[PDB]
């Protein structure tokens, strides 16, 4: 019958690894690098679009940075289509929480929920896992500014600074070298772009090959603002930091 053709996506290897999760991670390692850096007065999200074209409509394009709600955003590394399925689910979860408790969803609770969905695909159902790694950048009144990452295994962890996608080994070393705890957003912006500029597989880092975002309390008084950078604004910050 059908058994013959079953790849069995949810099984352990003899070494105790999940084949499909490991191969999904291999897929993600070829995706454009995404970086998150948490500062005392905000969070930075920086990501590299993959080998683009001159005819690509960049200002209406979105492949890396997505808004989950007004307080929480994600950077994507892997299959974009897979990511959008999960993103829409996360958006709904945030609204369910807001409807139920009349308060914005705490960042971790949203992260845990999505990470649990990923986990389920590795344990039951016989389907392939989502080939996606997320960097979550968010704010709530309990823990303030937070960075998380999740991968196809459904495991998530918190970070001060982190990278996903290609060249994470090189990227993480560079971040670990120059990161400090008393760092500010404007400094973090510079670190993120410098790290991408050194780890990129492209010849040079330009505005058309980047997506950029910040989450700041640089919103008028006690509140938080999300800023998805426009192509011209990415071009300006590249000049400001002295990369182009």
């Amino acid at each position: 019958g059908s058994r013959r053709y079953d790849s069995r996506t949810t099984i352990f290897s003899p070494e105790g690894r999940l084949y499909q999760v490991e191969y999904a991670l291999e897929s993600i390692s070829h995706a454009g690098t995404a970086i998150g850096i948490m500062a005392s007065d905000g969070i930075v999200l920086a990501a590299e679009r993959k080998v683009t074209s001159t005819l690509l409509e960049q200002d209406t394009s979105t492949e890396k940075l997505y808004k989950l709600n007004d307080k929480i955003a994600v950077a994507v590394a892997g299959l974009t289509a897979d990511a959008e399925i999960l993103i829409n689910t996360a958006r709904i979860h945030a609204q369910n929480y807001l409807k139920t408790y009349n308060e914005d969803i705490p960042v971790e609770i949203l992260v845990r929920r999505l990470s649990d969905i990923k986990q389920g695909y590795t344990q039951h159902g016989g389907l392939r896992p989502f080939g996606v790694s997320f960097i979550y950048a968010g704010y709530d009144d309990r823990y303030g500014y937070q960075l998380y990452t999740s991968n196809p295994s459904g495991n998530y962890t918190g970070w001060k600074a982190i990278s996903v996608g290609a060249n994470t080994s090189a990227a993480q070393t560079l971040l670990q070298m120059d990161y400090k705890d008393d760092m500010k957003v404007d400094d973090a912006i510079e670190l993120a772009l410098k790290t991408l500029s050194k780890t990129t597989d492209s010849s040079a880092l330009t505005y058309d090959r980047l997506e950029f975002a910040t989450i700041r309390k640089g919103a008028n008084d006690g509140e938080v603002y999300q800023k998805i950078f426009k192509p011209q604004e990415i071009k300006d910050i590249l000049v400001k930091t002295g990369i182009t």
Partner: protein, 250 residues
Amino acid sequence: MTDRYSFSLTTFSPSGKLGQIDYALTAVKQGVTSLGIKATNGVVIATEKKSSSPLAMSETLSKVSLLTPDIGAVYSGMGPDYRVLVDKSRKVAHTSYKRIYGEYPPTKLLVSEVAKIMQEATQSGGVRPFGVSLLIAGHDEFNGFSLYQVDPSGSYFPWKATAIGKGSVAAKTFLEKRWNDELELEDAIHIALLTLKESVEGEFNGDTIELAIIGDENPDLLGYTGIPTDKGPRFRKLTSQEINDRLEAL
């Protein structure tokens, strides 16, 4: 009976490749060339009507399809997969949008819905991916004119101009040289016809070429008068005669 294939047929290989998606993209590569060019006041989509037999009436086979009054689609790859996607795309535009908001969806969101369907065929149990790449051109009030490509993976990208299928690599290079941000719709149609001639071997005329535009509202194609706000569809399929007229000024 029962569909006992409740497991994924697309899976990650050791190298991180999703084989069935790659192979679907290979099927798209073998497909006949189709293209799309965005102008300042319109969008054009075009393809070759590769007739399987001269006894076949190629007018009855529509490669360029209306999805909504302001959105049109064309493809490269497997025709039957495209046909059913058009049926689903037309319906989802109503069920998940028009019946809720009382208006047709914007291009990007209809594309998103089509993309979702294609993504699900890449992960759901007991199905292969769709063997097509779609080029969807459209217009809506707040986003203006737009052109999107949708691949078998479900990934979609907005383009100023692009080509897919047989001679896409050569066609995209041709479009890069000719495209600018000041093109009028007639200029885009002219460039479309030029680009498309390179990939066509045999007859090149209005009967062997299928071409449509997203442009100005067509009140003559609305079918009724009396409501000022209803001004007619922006999608229009060019006739065999209309194509031949522009082939003399080629």
